[PDB]
Amino acid sequence: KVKLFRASEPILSVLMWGVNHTINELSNVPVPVMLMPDDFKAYSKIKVDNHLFNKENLPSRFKFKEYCPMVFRNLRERFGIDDQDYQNSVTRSAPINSRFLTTYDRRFVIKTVSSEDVAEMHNILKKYHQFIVECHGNTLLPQFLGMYRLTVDGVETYMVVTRNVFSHRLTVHRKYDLKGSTREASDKEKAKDLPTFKDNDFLNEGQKLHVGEESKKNFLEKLKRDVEFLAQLKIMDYSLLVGIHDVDRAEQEEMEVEERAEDGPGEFDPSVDVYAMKSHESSPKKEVYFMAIIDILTPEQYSKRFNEFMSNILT
Amino acid sequence: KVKLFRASEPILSVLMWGVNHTINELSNVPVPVMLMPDDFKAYSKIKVDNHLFNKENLPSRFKFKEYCPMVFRNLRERFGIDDQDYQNSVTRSAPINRFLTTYDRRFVIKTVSSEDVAEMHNILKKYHQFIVECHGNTLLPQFLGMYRLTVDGVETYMVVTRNVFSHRLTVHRKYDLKREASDKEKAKDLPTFKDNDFLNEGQLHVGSKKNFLEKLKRDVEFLAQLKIMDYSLLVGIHDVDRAERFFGPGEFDPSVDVYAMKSHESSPKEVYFMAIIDILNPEQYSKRFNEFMSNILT
Numbered sequence A: 001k002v003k004l005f006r007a008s009e010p011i012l013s014v015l016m017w018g019v020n021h022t023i024n025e026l027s028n029v030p031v032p033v034m035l036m037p038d039d040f041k042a043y044s045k046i047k048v049d050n051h052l053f054n055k056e057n058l059p060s061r062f063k064f065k066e067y068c069p070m071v072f073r074n075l076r077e078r079f080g081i082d083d084q085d086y087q088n089s090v091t092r093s094a095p096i097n098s099r100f101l102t103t104y105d106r107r108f109v110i111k112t113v114s115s116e117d118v119a120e121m122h123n124i125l126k127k128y129h130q131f132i133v134e135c136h137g138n139t140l141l142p143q144f145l146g147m148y149r150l151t152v153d154g155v156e157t158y159m160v161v162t163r164n165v166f167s168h169r170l171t172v173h174r175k176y177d178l179k180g181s182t183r184e185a186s187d188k189e190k191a192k193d194l195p196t197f198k199d200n201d202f203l204n205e206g207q208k209l210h211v212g213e214e215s216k217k218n219f220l221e222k223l224k225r226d227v228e229f230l231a232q233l234k235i236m237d238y239s240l241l242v243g244i245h246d247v248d249r250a251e252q253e254e255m256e257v258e259e260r261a262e263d264g265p266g267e268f269d270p271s272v273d274v275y276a277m278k279s280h281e282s283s284p285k286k287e288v289y290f291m292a293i294i295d296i297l298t299p300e301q302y303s304k305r306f307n308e309f310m311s312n313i314l315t
Numbered sequence B: 001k002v003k004l005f006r007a008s009e010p011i012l013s014v015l016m017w018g019v020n021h022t023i024n025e026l027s028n029v030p031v032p033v034m035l036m037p038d039d040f041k042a043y044s045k046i047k048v049d050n051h052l053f054n055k056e057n058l059p060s061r062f063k064f065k066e067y068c069p070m071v072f073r074n075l076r077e078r079f080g081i082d083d084q085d086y087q088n089s090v091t092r093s094a095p096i097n098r099f100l101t102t103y104d105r106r107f108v109i110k111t112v113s114s115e116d117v118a119e120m121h122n123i124l125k126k127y128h129q130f131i132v133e134c135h136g137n138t139l140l141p142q143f144l145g146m147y148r149l150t151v152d153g154v155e156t157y158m159v160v161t162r163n164v165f166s167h168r169l170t171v172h173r174k175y176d177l178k179r180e181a182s183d184k185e186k187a188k189d190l191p192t193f194k195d196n197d198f199l200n201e202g203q204l205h206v207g208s209k210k211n212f213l214e215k216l217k218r219d220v221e222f223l224a225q226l227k228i229m230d231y232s233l234l235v236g237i238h239d240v241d242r243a244e245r246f247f248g249p250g251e252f253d254p255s256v257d258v259y260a261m262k263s264h265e266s267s268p269k270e271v272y273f274m275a276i277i278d279i280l281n282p283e284q285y286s287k288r289f290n291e292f293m294s295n296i297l298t
């Protein structure tokens, strides 16, 4: 039961403490019939000073601000995310891989963003929300689950929590960040195991994703609505994040995994792995793809242009 | 299980919120092998500043400070009180009627002065050590928590203790024993009498007297050593017959009504309640006080 908030950095402990704290408090707040205008400019703030108390993991002094908590709570709900699950993903064990964090179970991504990013979120929040209502949470856009400001040692850090584009389980074997705007991977980037490849990289290696006509139609219809939505808001330079999971390769990796220790396959819950699609039955390699738009905080031409590219990615 | 923190006054909402918050926080803190000197100088402070959020019952801005939370949690344990139950008593419904009790009447919430808080810190280490040594068996006020609430820039200090009276059995007559009751006072639904009124009335029959006295004395010698005085014995009397699926006549849970004592078999049917209160020449005071109390037990 006991939550220790142990983490590699004090800022991670405070993140865990603050999500824990704000979600518990929200559980004592009725769920409204509708959101009101003020909810979009609301915040909670708490300042803690623990003297000679409760300091094994947390600093004695820190501050945690949550922006528009009623709105993000409604967003979680619309994205089919339970508040206790959310809280648990963040608090049961420390977020990992640091900033760009993942929750320990890899369900949620925690991004460190600028103050300008936080301002943009407020600017677009009402229209983002409404767009979410009318598409019933069916969208390739980033799914914003929470937005926070942490203060540790008098230093402010801003974070936005989103849903992971990738499968919280299935391994990603190759990834691209695509724009479609007149961009390749460095020798240094490629230096790392999972290099992030780009447009000219995707096109160069004759890459194509066969997903099947119904999946292709649904994907392109989301993409269309999404990119036109971002166009109207005047947003530029976002990308499509593409992950590729090789089913056979992962199966072998698992076998090797087990052998080293002792010394389904290509299946996912469309409910949890929300951007995942299977490769076309008549596809060379058995694969699973993860595709979603990212970085829509940091027009018309970019949308159409970025739309055409992504469209010619599928078959 | 939505805990709104609805109360008659904002200060009580904050109290409910604060007890809820600090108890919940403490459930994430390991119970230590012992208390250390630092724990008697410790505190938790939280300052809340909500804008356009969650201000249906709570003010948007307030502060809550808990003194020596490790010590008072150890006290709660040594007093046989589970933290969740304590938390539930304060928090499930608003405290009722500054002299409050929780809605279930188990705990009394006392508003005290800054100097009271100073004095509690002054005696806390010895009070604790004494509670250890007497194995929690004492007639002294049981100090369960101590808080400072800041609301509208105004600081309010509070101590939570166990109610001396039963949380159920109605009290039919009470005495403050160390002097009589004033005219206006004698004219109350339940006025408080004093030594003279007790002597004049000719009023307590019990097995237990020996053990109550063995308790009384130990405690009072402790209070003398602290050079404390002016404390009193708060006595309550439940007349069973007057009060007469359910709980029956004179029925009580001794683990909950810790000071309750039933009347002797050969007695004119009563449940009494007795404990020392208000402890925040003292040699003389103690022995006098201790002498007067022995004469009430037959």
Ligand SMILES: Nc1ncnc2c1ncn2[C@@H]1O[C@H](COP(=O)(O)O)[C@@H](O)[C@H]1O
Pocket (backbone or CB within 6 Å): A040, A041, A042, A115, A116, A118, A119, A122, A123, A149
């Ligand atoms: N209600 C709001 N509407 C628009 N921008 C905001 C709002 N609250 C904060 N910001 C911006 O978000 C950034 C961080 O704000 P602060 O929370 O005061 O650290 C700054 O660029 C602020 O101007």
Ligand SMILES: Nc1ncnc2c1ncn2[C@@H]1O[C@H](COP(=O)(O)O)[C@@H](O)[C@H]1O
Pocket (backbone or CB within 6 Å): A100, A109, A162, A163, A164, A165, A166, A177, A196, A241, A294, A295
């Ligand atoms: N929602 C997300 N899910 C998974 N990975 C992400 C997500 N957002 C960003 N990334 C990854 O983080 C890297 C850095 O993102 P950024 O720092 O925004 O460029 C990207 O190249 C992706 O690999």
Ligand SMILES: Nc1ncnc2c1ncn2[C@@H]1O[C@H](COP(=O)(O)O)[C@@H](O)[C@H]1O
Pocket (backbone or CB within 6 Å): A252, A256
């Ligand atoms: N069933 C298999 N399918 C594909 N590659 C395999 C298979 N079994 C072994 N390998 C590969 O052959 C090499 C030797 O693996 P091992 O038999 O585990 O020592 C490694 O590169 C493995 O990935």
Ligand SMILES: Nc1ncnc2c1ncn2[C@@H]1O[C@H](COP(=O)(O)O)[C@@H](O)[C@H]1O
Pocket (backbone or CB within 6 Å): B099, B108, B161, B162, B163, B164, B165, B192, B234, B277, B278
């Ligand atoms: N622990 C207690 N349990 C029940 N009533 C109490 C307790 N302490 C004080 N009182 C009553 O609270 C009222 C005022 O307290 P005070 O003026 O502080 O002595 C008096 O009626 C006391 O009899």
